[PDB]
Every structure is written in C-alpha cells, then in structure tokens.
Design an enzyme around this catalytic site. Structure first.
Site: not given
Length: 318
Positions: A43, A48, A77, A110
C-alpha cells in the site's frame, strides 16, 4: 493468505505491507524482505515519496524469481494536486514509471481535496505546495470529473480497480450516483478510538471493501503528544485492549489488527522489523468473541488523527 474479492472481480490480499512512513534508506530492502516473507499487497502513494524505492524492491524480487508481477497487488494513491482530468494521467504515469510496472492493481483518490496543479518538473511529490509559495491554493474540479478520468484509465488498462480514501458518507453516496465503475475500496483511518461504525456498515452494505489505516491509533511523535494532552492512553497501553490480549494470550498489536481483519476489513500495518513482520502476517490465529467486540466498541471517542482541518481548515470531516 486470505483474500477479499473486490466488486471489480479481482482478489485483494486482506493483509498487506504499508509503505506509508517507511524508512527511506531501507525501503527497497524492506520491500524485497517482505515479498520474500510472503507479503503480496503493498500500500503506496505518490505522497509517500518512495515509489521508486518500492519499485526497486519489487524489481529485485521479480528478477530473482521469488514472485511474478501478477502475484503482487500494488496500491497507489492520486495526490491532491492531480485531480483535474488533464493531469490525472500525468500523475499515474509517474507512479507506474517509479514502480517500474505497466498497471497498478488499485489507484485511490488520496483525499477529496483539490490543490492547484504543480508541474511534476517543478516539485515532486508536492505535498502541501500549491504553486503559491507557502500558501495553499485550490482548483474547482468536482470529484466526479476526477473519477471519470480514473474510469478512462481503467478502460486504458493502466489500473485494474479504483477507489477512494478519506471520503465521508455523504460524499461517497453522491459519488455512487455518478460512477459508471463503482468504487471497489474505501480506505480510512480506522482504530478503536475512531470507529465510524455507520460508515463501515454503509460501505460494506454496498459491496465496497474497507481498508483501515492507522490500526494502532496514535504512533507518531505528534499523535502521542496529543494523546498525552488529552489524557488518552496509547492503544497498546489501553486497559481494554490489554485485558483482551491477556485473555487470548496475544499481543495488543494482534488484538488491534484482529479487530479489523475479523470484520472483513483489510489491514496494511507498518511492519518495520522482522518481529512485527511475522506477527502482523499471522493476525488470524485467534478469534475475538462477542464480549471482546462489545468491550472494544466502548472505546470510540471520535479521536481523529488525520484531519485536513489541521492543514488549512478544509472541511472534509465536518
């Protein structure tokens, strides 16, 4: 091992490896290590700032013959600057390029928040930068416009399944009225301090799979400071959680994850240590009983750690 069948027809691993907040310098090796251990869902997200690092770990494992691409479930996302239909594909192309893959298994919106587009050559990933120095700036792109662009990308073969993260009920309900491809997944902050049981029941009743994040409640420096300021114990130290763990001969971490996995909610814990890595993979080794579920339900205090109100008074959860 266990799998959730998405309304798009694909199988999603019920227990995955969470790439949010993974150590930058060991990310690729942890991914490789995790694949070697048997993790199949990863995930991830553009925000990130590690998708190249994830793709390198994936790449290594596929090269050594440990897994084939079709065995992995890669989630990414779409970030808040990339909602305009002109830009959704630019974002997704960078994800795919970083991951060194031709499709992602799951691509989520997101947040239901539309930051002004920033060229990827200027800054990537942009975080809270909206092209106006230190100031937030927004653009008027309704959710459904973004969704229709995602649908196009699904039909172009670049995404298998699409869904949403951090959507409240009324907004998810309205999305369902305009969607041609229904959302397959709803990903939300979900732990015993923020249970949102009607939201869960709603999503599940429509055949939408729910993925929990922050299954352990407060963990960051900031979240644990809030906790102390609120006189609220960390969930690992909470007396109910410890009592249930004791009762089953289990760790509080295992009770926290099982709480979700037993209700059919997907989990994506950060497993940053070989001990955590193996404990978090075998969460389904015991069953909580009806009294355990009743005791845990009393913990809900609507304590939300991830709130765009804190960024710029954006009214997502109000």
């Amino acid at each position: 091992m266990p799998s959730i069948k998405l309304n798009s027809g694909y199988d999603m691993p019920a227990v995955g490896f969470g790439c949010w907040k993974v150590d930058v310098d060991t990310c690729s090796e942890q991914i490789y290590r995790a694949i070697k251990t048997g993790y199949r869902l990863f995930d991830g997200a553009e925000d990130y700032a590690n998708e190249k690092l994830v793709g390198a770990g994936v790449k290594k494992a596929i090269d050594e013959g440990i897994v084939k691409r079709e065995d992995l479930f890669l989630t990414s996302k779409l970030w808040n600057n990339y909602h305009h239909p002109d830009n959704v594909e630019k974002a997704l192309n960078r994800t795919l390029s970083d991951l060194q893959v031709d499709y992602v298994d799951l691509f989520l919106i997101h947040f239901p928040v539309t930051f002004k587009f920033v060229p990827l050559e200027e800054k990537y990933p942009p975080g809270f930068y909206c092209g106006k120095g230190d100031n937030f700036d927004y653009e008027d792109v309704p959710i459904l416009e973004t969704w229709k662009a995602l649908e196009k990308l699904v039909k172009a073969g670049k995404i298998r399944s699409i869904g949403v993260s951090n959507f409240p009920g009324a907004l998810l309900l309205d999305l369902l009225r305009g969607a041609t491809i229904k959302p397959s997944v709803l990903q939300v902050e979900h732990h015993p301090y923020l249970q949102q049981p009607r939201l869960i029941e709603f999503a599940q009743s429509r055949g939408i799979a729910v993925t929990a994040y922050s299954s352990f409640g407060p963990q960051s420096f900031v979240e644990l400071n809030q906790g102390r300021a609120l006189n609220t114990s960390p969930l690992f130290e909470n007396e109910t959680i410890k009592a249930i763990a004791a009762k089953h001969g289990k760790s509080p971490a295992q009770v926290l994850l099982r709480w979700s996995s037993q209700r059919g909610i997907a989990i994506i814990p950060k497993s940053n240590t070989v001990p955590r890595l193996l404990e978090n993979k075998d969460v389904n080794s015991f069953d909580l009983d009806e009294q355990d579920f009743a005791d845990i339900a009393k913990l809900d205090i609507n304590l939300r750690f991830n709130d765009p109100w804190d960024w710029d008074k954006i009214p997502i959860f109000v």
